């Protein structure tokens, strides 16, 4: 029914440039240019949209809704790092601050009367790291139950070990289902 | 539920221009310019749209549908001369 997509805007990201020589026949080398943010530089910005494909028609505009990250992330530079469809009317978005030691899962529900995707504080789940970064290379992805009322996700133990925790979609506390020095 | 509207495009319509003198204090007359098609001139073109206002929200796109005239009119220059809502689902 829906097609979700992200749009990346690299307008202010500096370009790395380097020569590409190509085949021996090319008389003048080419200069490759790529928007590439080096440490501390301006980063690309992201927008996440959900398109309702039911109305797609040559004489119709596109029906879409932009979902923004929660306030605690929208506040500064951030990255979209995960997108998981839960049901046809529930989608899970995982965002992370640029510092990458604070991430949040935002579970948005489709409102049939307005076509909006609504978020609620009760459906948000925060994951932070005071001693490093969140996850191995990025936060682990949530794995929802068929009904979407709960999910399982790997997070760091009280002991620092990554284990599976069971979360209720609308509750903040989770329960670890695995444990151990592994 | 819906908001229908027309858009007129006067890009190719010639301009009638005339002086407007204004209050006596105005040192230089202004020239009023209006897209006005005289007999046989290029006319404004029109498009008709129906907006579904149920999805209007700050972060939503506008859901709209363009309704084009029947082939027998679409063929050449034409005008939209009337709009009548019949029911919530018929125009
Ligand atoms: C991509 O991001 C740039 C900002 O880096 C946007 O550019 C701004 O656009 C607004 C509206 O047109 C202008 O008022 C600003 O002056 C622009 N800023 C700069 C630095 O150019 C641009 O609109 C974004 N593009 C899209 C499609 O999202
Ligand atoms: C969509 O617009 C095209 C314009 O060429 C028109 O031919 C077509 O009939 C329109 N769709 C319908 C059937 O409403
Ligand atoms: C995250 O890292 C930033 C440094 O860029 C620091 O200001 C902030 O206190 C850190 N937050 C946590 C939860 O450790
Ligand atoms: C108005 O009509 C001109 C052609 O006369 C066209 O180039 C332009 O795109 C039209 N503008 C809009 C917004 O439809
Ligand atoms: C719409 O997006 C802006 C950021 O572009 C955000 O401040 C605002 O909260 C969003 N609207 C709602 C009610 O989700």
Q: List CB contacts (< 8 A) between A61 and chain B.
A: 61-65
Please choose from B58, B60, B61 the residue to mutate so as to test ligand 5's pocket, defined by most ligand atoms within 8 A of CB.
B58
Q: List CB contacts (< 8 A) between B63 and chain A.
A: 55, 60-61, 63, 115
Burial B44-81 (b: 16+ CB within 10 A, else e): beeebbbbbeebeeeebbebbbeeeeeeeeeeeeeeee
Give the best residue of A3, A54, A61 to mutate against chain B (max B CB count within 10 A): A61
Q: Is A37 helix (H, G, I), strand (E, B) or coil?
A: coil
User: Which residue bears the tokens 């992201």?
Assistant: A46
Query: Which residue from A94, A112, A93 is spatially nearest to A103, judged by alpha carbons?
Result: A94
Positive or negative, the Cα torsion across A164, A95, A124, A87?
negative
Which experimental technique did the depositors report for determining this structure? X-ray
Q: How many Å lie between the centroid of ligand 3 and the Cα of residue A75?
A: 14
Q: Which ligand is nearest to the CA of B11?
A: 4
Strand (E) or helix (H) holding A105: strand A102-111
Nearest C-alpha in B relative to A65:
B60
Q: Is A122 helix (H, G, I), strand (E, B) or coil?
A: helix
Q: Please, which residues bridge with residue B67 across strands?
A: B48
CB contact under 8 A, A115 and B65: no
Q: Please, which residues bridge with residue A9 across strands?
A: A45
End-to-end Cα distance, chain B: 12
In this structure, which long-range contacts are made by residues A37-42, counting pairs with CB atoms below 8 Å and at least 24 apart in sequence?
A37/A13, A38/A14, A41/A13, A41/A14, A42/A12, A42/A13, A42/A14
Positive or negative, the Cα torsion across A155, A156, A158, A159?
positive
For residue A130, what are the contacts with CB-CB under 8 A and spacing of at least 6?
Answer: A101
Query: Which residue from B71, B54, B48 is spatially nearest to A59, judged by alpha carbons?
Result: B48
Q: Please, which residues bridge with residue A105 across strands?
A: A94, A125
């Amino acid at each position: 029914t829906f097609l979700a997509y992200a749009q990346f805007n690299d307008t202010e990201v500096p370009l790395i440039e380097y020569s590409f020589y190509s085949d021996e026949s090319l008389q003048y080398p080419k200069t490759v240019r790529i928007p590439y943010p080096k440490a501390g530089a301006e980063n690309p910005t992201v927008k996440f949209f959900v398109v309702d494909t039911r109305t797609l028609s040559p004489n119709a505009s596109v029906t879409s809704y932009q979902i923004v990250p929660p306030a605690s992330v929208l506040i500064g530079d951030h990255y979209l790092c995960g997108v998981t469809w839960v049901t046809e009317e529930r989608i899970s978005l995982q965002w992370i601050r640029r510092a990458q030691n604070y991430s949040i899962i935002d579970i948005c529900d489709y409102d049939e009367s307005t076509g909006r995707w609504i978020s609620s504080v009760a459906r948000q789940h925060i994951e932070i790291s005071t001693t490093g970064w969140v996850g191995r290379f990025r936060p682990a992805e949530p794995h929802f139950t068929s009904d979407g009322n709960s999910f399982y996700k790997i997070i760091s133990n009280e002991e620092g070990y990554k284990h599976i925790c069971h979360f209720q979609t609308d509750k903040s506390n989770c329960t670890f289902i695995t444990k151990g020095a592994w």
